[PDB]
Amino acid sequence: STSQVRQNYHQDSEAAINRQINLELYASYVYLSMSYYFDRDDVALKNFAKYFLHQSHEEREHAEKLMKLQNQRGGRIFLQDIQKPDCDDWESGLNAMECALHLEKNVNQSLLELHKLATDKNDPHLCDFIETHYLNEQVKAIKELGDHVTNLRKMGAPESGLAEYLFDKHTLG
Amino acid sequence: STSQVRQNYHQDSEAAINRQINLELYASYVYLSMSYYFDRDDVALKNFAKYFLHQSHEEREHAEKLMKLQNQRGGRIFLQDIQKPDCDDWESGLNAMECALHLEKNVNQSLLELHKLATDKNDPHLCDFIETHYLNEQVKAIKELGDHVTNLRKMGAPESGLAEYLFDKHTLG
Amino acid sequence: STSQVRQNYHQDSEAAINRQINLELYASYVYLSMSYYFDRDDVALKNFAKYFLHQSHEEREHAEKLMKLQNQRGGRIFLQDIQKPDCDDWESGLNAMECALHLEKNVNQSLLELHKLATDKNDPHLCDFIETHYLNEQVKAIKELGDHVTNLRKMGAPESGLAEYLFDKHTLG
Amino acid sequence: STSQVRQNYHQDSEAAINRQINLELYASYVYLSMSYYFDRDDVALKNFAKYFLHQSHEEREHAEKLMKLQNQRGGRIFLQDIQKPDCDDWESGLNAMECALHLEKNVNQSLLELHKLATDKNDPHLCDFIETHYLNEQVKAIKELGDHVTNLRKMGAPESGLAEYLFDKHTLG
Amino acid sequence: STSQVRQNYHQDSEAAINRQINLELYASYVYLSMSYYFDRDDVALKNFAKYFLHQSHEEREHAEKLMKLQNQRGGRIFLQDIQKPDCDDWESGLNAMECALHLEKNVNQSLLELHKLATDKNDPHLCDFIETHYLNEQVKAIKELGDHVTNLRKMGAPESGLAEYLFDKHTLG
Amino acid sequence: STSQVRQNYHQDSEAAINRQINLELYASYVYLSMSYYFDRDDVALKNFAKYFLHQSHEEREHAEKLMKLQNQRGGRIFLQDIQKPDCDDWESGLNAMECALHLEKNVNQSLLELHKLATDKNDPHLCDFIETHYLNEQVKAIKELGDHVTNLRKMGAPESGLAEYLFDKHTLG
Ligand code: NA
Ligand code: NA
Ligand code: NA
Ligand code: NA
Ligand code: NA
Ligand code: NA
Ligand code: NA
């Protein structure tokens, strides 16, 4: 049952990739939830909605790239349930950005653990894959979300509705 | 005196269409009133004025489409007086948007009653006409006005003149 | 309560402008009625319908220009009910053109009274506005309608259905 | 023998669609007959001929769309004989337009019965298909033919050969 | 807590839309699973992979449109876990197409139940939404999958590897 | 009652043209039946469907050209019922092509009899019409269908579903 393509690809690496697929799909779902919160008539921040929908689609692309990797290396994809997000109501633009920052840091931690595993199993292709496609993307995402949180806080969010309105227009628009 | 084209078109449907024509013309007049309120030198919100004038013209188009339908089906148009709007002075951008939301919901209720009548009289052409041309347009209008009211309220309208100014520029501009 | 912009604008002038707004809106409604008469399956003169719809839209533009003037001068718009037209059935192309000619002459008489008022109140801006935007437009409209009535009568309308058909095609098309 | 695609598609609906196919093919044949009547050297109204040929081709397209629907839903097409039209000689442009109006109203009645059946069998796809593709097309056709009959009658057809000549040129050309 | 936009939108309808969102997301996940099965080195049917990935993305779009509808009507989105697909290994191109056909028929049945609910609750906007955006799309999908299953079976799949190869090239390519 | 245009046009020729019109319309209907057989979900050969629909439309054009001829010569068109095709289910691509070949040979035989009649009645215009517009078209059609039957038989149709699939793609596509 060993794939004809498989070479230097540890069972532990294969399992870790399957976990990461699920995590990326989860993140996609979280961002989808956040997007449609901002689309509510009682929230009505269209550029927050657009921002989070974009992130949702990006996370799905990240999951699909891991699925491609799994097959390229001769591993086998095992999908699991995608858990529902922790919240239905995301409270405010600031709260959502803070939740996103926490999520991105959790995803980054998982990727750092995957890189460590790849290094420990002497799998340089996998290590390089993670470095090239995932780690700088995560650092950039985290920096962007931190910048957003800083700006929102400085502007007076979430108490000032005018802050979120103007941030939506000027930063996210 | 029965029209050569008339088929499956109940007298009650014909009467309901004449009522809806009047209601659309009324709505057009309300929006016209609102438009020119915002054009006053002591109000001076040009994009509110433009928004409501556009809505006025759209409502007139809606009325004319119903008039076309009446003739297409072999009904006879009977026009009535167009009543003056309830207010001359619309107080604020927020108050006008709230009044518009109420108006749109009243128009939607009338269209839902018309659809029910068409269904009750087994007039699928009329039911389809209302679904295709009126019902989603109303849902969209109501959602847009609700979004506007939410944003204005969050920004601090009507107490903050700066709120209405910035909404006029950034949302309606 | 005097507008910051108001200068040399008499209360009687302001009232006369509000009356003229109503008259223009009334004329728009009359022409709308006439338009849709010609769209009936038992009348079926598409170019008569188009002609009168154009006139309807033009009269609305005339009303809106007066509303703009009212605000430019610091007067206050007071809308009134728009009365229904005198007829539902306009009988013939010739009869409608004759009714239009009568309407246009009534509107012109009202504008001449407004000009006289402006002159009497030493309001040269208002007098000029009426001269520039309204009086030659009315003279042209009246001359055009008179030409149409003459042609229809000479061709044998309304007794000849062939007359109205050919006029619809060759003059109004 | 149940199609793998079939879902929510009643035997009565399938039968009614087969009847409607035949009716559309019949209508196509009627219009073909009318077309070539106008092409006769002793009739010689080329634009009447063109008008009816266009209608013939349109009715065939309508039949083919129903055949497509039958297969989409997993029903089975059963064709029947296409009966010859009621007349060989259509007498006049006015008489043909009156016969067309009668035909279109008969087709519309059949479509309204089909819609009622679809609604009674809780087949919303079929009901929507009929509403979307057939009912407004029929209302428009009926209104157009009524307009044509009105104009021809007003112009003096069929006694005036000049009426049909000019209608052929100016309306149908 | 009633939304300012909500009108004629039953709690049962809102709940049914939330169920349909989950079902569409589930279908998206199934198709994703199927896609990456065909990308395996021991399966290696690139056009099957592309076909199912396209379907996955389409189902996600369908889910997002329902989420938009929920907010447009003033309902509240409640997400649930996305269950993992029933299979990890989809056996063959034919087996996957058969599983897809079964899935599409299940989704269609759910949409027909939603339409019945909308009709029962006199919600014509919702009924129209389902008819316009979902029901013909499902009929087309089901017909396409049935055609694919027929062709694969006729060609000798799944026993003939040459059948799936050639179908992949000529139909899906 | 003799047409003003009629010259050298025998009553027997006129009758034979009316028979040929019916035969062409019949052939059109046969091909229509065949087309929609191939569109069935349990047959699913789209290029066979397209091929036969094209032939259906071509046969209708042939019928209309004969109708034009009848009027050009001052004959009078008498339409008859269009009989339903002999089969509802055409069994296979090969069987349909064989049935088409038989049909085309039957149509050709009728045209050869018409040419013989024209020659016997010293009607060179009619003979030339048939030669120019019909006889080479029939020879080409017969040769094409024979080629198709040969290829299908050589490839292993109808027992090989792979044969019809590949013929559909490579010859008819
Ligand atoms: Na990611
Ligand atoms: Na409206
Ligand atoms: Na509909
Ligand atoms: Na005027
Ligand atoms: Na039709
Ligand atoms: Na779907
Ligand atoms: Na032929």
From Swiss-Prot, chains A, B, C, D, E, F:
What EC designation does it have?
1.16.3.1
Please tell me where Fe cation 2 binds in this chain. 59, 104, 138
Q: Kindly report, in one word, the top-level EC class recorded for this enzyme.
A: oxidoreductase
Q: Which InterPro entries match?
A: Ferritin, Ferritin-like, Ferritin-like_diiron, Ferritin-like_SF, Ferritin_CS, Ferritin_DPS_dom
The family database entries (SUPFAM superfamilies) matched by this protein are listed as: Ferritin-like
Q: Which GO terms describe its molecular function?
A: ferric iron binding; ferrous iron binding; ferroxidase activity; identical protein binding; iron ion binding; iron ion sequestering activity
Subcellular localization, as worded in the UniProt entry: Cytoplasm; Lysosome; Cytoplasmic vesicle, Autophagosome
Residue ranges of domain Ferritin-like diiron in the record: 7-156
Nucleus recorded as keyword: no
Q: Where is this site: Essential for association with cargo receptor NCOA4?
A: 19
Spell out the reaction equation it catalyses.
4 Fe(2+) + O2 + 4 H(+) = 4 Fe(3+) + 2 H2O
* Annotated positions binding Fe cation 1: 24, 59, 62
Where on the tree of life does the source sit, at the highest rank?
Eukaryota
Q: What is its main location?
A: cytoplasm
GO biological process assignments: immune response; intracellular iron ion homeostasis; iron ion transport; negative regulation of cell population proliferation; negative regulation of ferroptosis; negative regulation of fibroblast proliferation
Q: What does this protein do?
A: Stores iron in a soluble, non-toxic, readily available form. Important for iron homeostasis. Has ferroxidase activity. Iron is taken up in the ferrous form and deposited as ferric hydroxides after oxidation. Also plays a role in delivery of iron to cells. Mediates iron uptake in capsule cells of the developing kidney. Delivery to lysosomes is mediated by the cargo receptor NCOA4 for autophagic degradation and release of iron.
- Note the subunit structure: Oligomer of 24 subunits. There are two types of subunits: L (light) chain and H (heavy) chain. The major chain can be light or heavy, depending on the species and tissue type. In the human liver, the heavy chain is predominant. The functional molecule forms a roughly spherical shell with a diameter of 12 nm and contains a central cavity into which the insoluble mineral iron core is deposited. Interacts with NCOA4; NCOA4 promotes targeting of the iron-binding ferritin complex to autolysosomes following starvation or iron depletion.
| Family designation | Belongs to the ferritin family.
Q: What is this protein called?
A: Ferritin heavy chain
Q: Which organism is it from?
A: Homo sapiens (Human)
